[PDB]
Design a protein around this ligand. Structure first.
Ligand SMILES: CC(=O)N1CCc2cc(S(=O)(=O)N3CCN(c4cc(Cl)cc(C(F)(F)F)c4)CC3)ccc21
Ligand SMILES: [Mn+2]
Ligand SMILES: [Mn+2]
Length: 242
C-alpha cells in the first residue's frame, strides 16, 4: 500500500500533532511501499539552516522510515515552499515537482499539493507568484536567520488579521494535461472523494484532510483507494448500566 498525507502544519506549539506524526512514522508508515507528503508538513519554513529542534526531530523520524526500506517523497505546500535539499538529505526524503504522475499498482494518479487548483483566489496566487520567484527566494534565504524569523512572524500575524476551494475547470485541465482519471491533493482541508469526468471518462479527485484533531491519510492499494482518519495517540481502552 502507498500512503499519502498532507496539511499536518507541524509546529512546536502543537506537540500533540507532532506526537501523532511520530507514532504514524513508527507504525503505519513502516509497512507502506512508499510515503508521499503532499505539502504543508510544517506550519512555517524560513530555510533549511533554521536550527528549530522540531525540524531535526522530524527529519530523524522520517529518516528512520527511509532506513526501514520505505521511500519517502515530498511535494511543497504553500506554507513550507522553502524546504530544500539540505532538509531532504537530513530526512532522506526525495523532493518532487509541484505536479507528479505516479503509477500506483496499474492506475495512473496525479499528485500535487492543491493550491495551484484554487484559481479563484487571485489574491493568493499573486502572493504565490512572488514567493516562488527564484531570485526572491535567493534574496530571502540570504537574509540573516533572526531577520527571517521576524519577517515570518510578522507576515503570519498580518495574515491572521477560510481557505478557498479548488476551481472545477482547473481540476479538469490538470487531469487532462496528465491524462489521468485519479487525482490526490490536499491544501483545501476538505477530505472528500469527488467524481467528475476527464478525458471523456469518469475521474476522481481525492482530497486529504488536515491534522486538526485526528490524523488523515489516503491509502492506495491494488484493490481500492481509502481515505482514513485515525487518532493521534494510542487511545487506551478502559471501562454504563442496564
Ligand atoms: C497564503 C500563504 O501561504 N501565507 C500567508 C502568510 C504566510 C507565511 C508563511 S511562513 O511563516 O512560513 N514564511 C515563509 C517564507 N516567507 C517569504 C519567502 C520569500 Cl521567497 C520572500 C518573502 C518576503 F516577502 F519577505 F520577501 C517572505 C516568509 C514567511 C508561509 C505561507 C504564508
Ligand atoms: Mn494546509
Ligand atoms: Mn496548503
Amino acid at each position: 500500500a502507498t500512503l499519502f498525507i498532507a496539511d499536518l502544519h507541524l509546529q512546536t506549539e502543537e506537540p500533540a500533532i507532532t506526537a501523532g506524526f511520530l507514532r504514524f512514522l513508527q507504525g503505519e508508515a513502516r509497512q507502506a511501499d512508499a510515503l508521499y507528503i503532499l505539502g504543508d508538513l510544517f506550519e512555517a519554513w524560513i530555510g533549511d539552516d533554521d536550527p528549530n529542534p522540531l525540524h531535526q526531530q522530524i527529519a530523524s523520524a522520517i529518516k528512520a522510515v527511509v532506513d526501514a526500506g520505505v521511500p519517502c517523497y515530498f511535494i511543497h505546500g504553500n506554507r513550507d515552499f522553502l524546504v530544500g535539499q539540505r532538509f531532504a538529505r537530513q530526512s532522506g526524503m526525495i523532493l518532487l515537482a509541484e505536479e507528479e504522475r505516479l503509477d500506483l499498482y496499474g492506475r495512473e494518479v496525479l499528485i500535487m499539493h492543491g493550491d495551484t487548483l484554487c484559481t479563484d483566489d487571485q489574491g493568493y496566487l499573486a502572493f504565490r507568484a512572488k514567493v516562488h520567484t527564484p531570485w526572491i527566494q535567493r534574496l530571502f534565504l540570504a537574509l540573516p536567520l533572526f531577520i527571517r524569523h521576524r519577517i515570518a512572524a510578522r507576515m503570519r500575524a498580518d495574515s491572521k488579521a477560510e481557505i478557498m476551494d479548488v476551481n472545477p475547470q482547473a481540476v479538469v485541465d490538470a487531469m487532462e494535461r496528465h491524462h489521468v482519471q485519479w487525482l490526490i491533493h490536499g491544501h483545501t482541508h476538505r477530505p472528500a472523494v469527488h467524481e467528475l469526468q476527464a478525458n471523456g471518462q469518469p475521474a476522481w479527485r481525492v482530497v486529504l484532510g488536515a491534522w486538526h484533531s485526528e490524523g488523515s491519510m489516503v491509502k492506495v492499494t491494488p484493490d481500492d483507494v481509502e481515505l482514513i482518519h485515525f487518532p493521534f495517540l494510542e487511545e487506551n481502552l478502559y471501562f454504563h448500566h442496564h
